[PDB]
Structure 1
Amino acid sequence: AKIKARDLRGKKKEELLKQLDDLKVELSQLRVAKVTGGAASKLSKIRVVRKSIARVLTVINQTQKENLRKFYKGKKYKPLDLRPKKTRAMRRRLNKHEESLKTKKQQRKERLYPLRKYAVKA
């Protein structure tokens, strides 16, 4: 009766939706049993069903977002949620290409007068 993500990874989307619907129906029945006295065995299944629902929804969301970012992999413009989210300042940071960019004057200076290795007392 245990629901594991390993089996849910390969299942089709419609099967996962049907499993989610069945779990939600079971959770509603468990709530009805809870408010009508019920039993300890029935009441302990509420957490199990809630965690199964969470697992199914997590698998659905992870698969959907992986496919979506696969689709946008290569496009210049991507949805904001798919963009990397490091920090407010780090996204305003330079592109790492302009930092290495050097003007012709700087390249001329470095090429003409490079820093050389030397030793003394000999």
Structure 2
Amino acid sequence: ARIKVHELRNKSKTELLAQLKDLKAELALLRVAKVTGGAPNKLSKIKVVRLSIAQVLTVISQKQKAALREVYKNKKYLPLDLRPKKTRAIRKRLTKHQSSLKTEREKKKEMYFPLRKYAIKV
């Protein structure tokens, strides 16, 4: 009957483009009916077809993005669109390792004289 998204994800790339082509052609006819005094029932189909076109485009874009992220997985440099967004300030932060870097003497103090666990007898 209507478009089911989980069924679209099982289709191949060519099938989605073919279905997208049909949906756009169908929507064009509905637009003609809207200006030629089409029946009210046919004017309600515009909303359904518009939803279908968006769903097909969403599946196509999601698959394309997912494949690209797998291609650049484990690569040093990624396209800016695929890099994490977060915030500007968060991206400029020192890494976790860099923030914890200390001098050799500071490292030795942590080992030689760390805070000890102790208690006072009552």
TM-score, length of structure 1 as denominator length: 0.96
Show the counterpart of 2:115: 115
Q: For residues 66-119 of structure 1, what are the alpha-carbon distances to aligned partners after superposition, in whole Å with 9 as ceiling and x for unaligned?
A: 000000000000000100000010101111111222221111111110100111
- Alpha-carbon shift at residue 15 of structure 1 (Å): 0.4
Show the counterpart of 1:13: 13
Q: For the aligned residues, what is the CA RMSD?
A: 0.9
Q: For residues 28-59 of structure 1, what are the alpha-carbon distances to aligned partners after superposition, in whole Å with 9 as ceiling and x for unaligned?
A: 00000110001111000001000000000000
Show the counterpart of 2:102: 102
Q: Secondary structure at the match of 2:117?
A: coil
TM-score, length of structure 2 as denominator length: 0.96
CA distance in 1 between counterparts of 2:12 and 2:69 reads 19
Q: Does 1:4 align with 2:7?
A: no
Taking the TM superposition and a 5 Å limit, the aligned residue runs for 1:38-57 are 38-57=38-57
Deviates more, 1:25-34 or 1:92-101: 92-101
Q: Flag structure 2 segments of 5+ consecutive residues without an equivalent.
A: none
| Aligned residues with identical type, % of pairs | 67
CA distance in 2 between counterparts of 1:103 and 1:21 reads 64
Q: Which amino acid in structure 2 is aligned with residue 103 of structure 1?
A: T
Q: Flag structure 1 segments of 5+ consecutive residues without an equivalent.
A: none
Show the counterpart of 1:77: 77
Q: Which amino acid in structure 2 is aligned with residue 89 of structure 1?
A: A
Q: Does 1:27 align with 2:27?
A: yes
